[PDB]
Amino acid sequence: AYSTREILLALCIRDSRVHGNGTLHPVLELAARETPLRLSPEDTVVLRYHVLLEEIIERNSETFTETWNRFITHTEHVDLDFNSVFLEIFHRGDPSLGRALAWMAWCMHACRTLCCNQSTPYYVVDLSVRGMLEASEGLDGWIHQQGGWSTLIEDNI
Amino acid sequence: DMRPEIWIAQELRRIGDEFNAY
Ligand SMILES: [Br-]
Ligand SMILES: [Br-]
Ligand SMILES: [Br-]
Ligand SMILES: [Br-]
Ligand SMILES: [Br-]
Ligand SMILES: [Br-]
Ligand SMILES: [Br-]
Ligand SMILES: [Br-]
Ligand SMILES: [Br-]
């Protein structure tokens, strides 16, 4: 019964805890307060997904770099634009585990890029994290049909 | 204008489908 927004936000926080200073961008603090996040970033389910998503990022390293750079340098309304990417992945055929993980990994990679670049304006980090979290709510129906995030990792991946 | 976002989704659908055999 953890929502996709909770699990993505926990993954992003964990990813921050293990990159650079291990410090959290103010935006991730805000998102935790407002969601509100009830899942620990050190929860085993989060550590396990974090490894799967890092594997997907590494395997598709350049494609993730390129797609994110094209996205962020072309958008005029960052949060809205996350929604467009989301719908084109998940309403173009049935959702699948792979597509769900590909999306989550892309989001976590975007958040990592934004938070590691000290020059990134606050508003770009803020609207991107809000955008990814809001768009990701669209996975809740399908993942519930799979018994939730915890079932999928423990039993299917 | 919305062209970057359609390419991005093409790539992630592809990546997700590759994973489905993984
Ligand atoms: Br905690
Ligand atoms: Br992959
Ligand atoms: Br990488
Ligand atoms: Br913007
Ligand atoms: Br960036
Ligand atoms: Br800041
Ligand atoms: Br700003
Ligand atoms: Br287990
Ligand atoms: Br298309």
Author numbering:
A (entry chain A): 2 to 158
B (entry chain B): 51 to 72
Paper text:
Some viruses, such as Epstein-Barr virus (EBV), encode homologs of the mammalian pro-survival protein Bcl-2. In this study, we have confirmed that EBV BHRF1 exerts its pro-survival function by directly inhibiting a sub-set of pro-apoptotic Bcl-2 family proteins Bid, Bim, Puma and Bak, presumably ones most critical for the virus. We have therefore determined crystal structures of BHRF1 in complex with its key targets, the BH3 domains of Bim and Bak. Our three-dimensional structures show that these interactions closely resemble those seen with mammalian pro-survival proteins such as Bcl-xL.
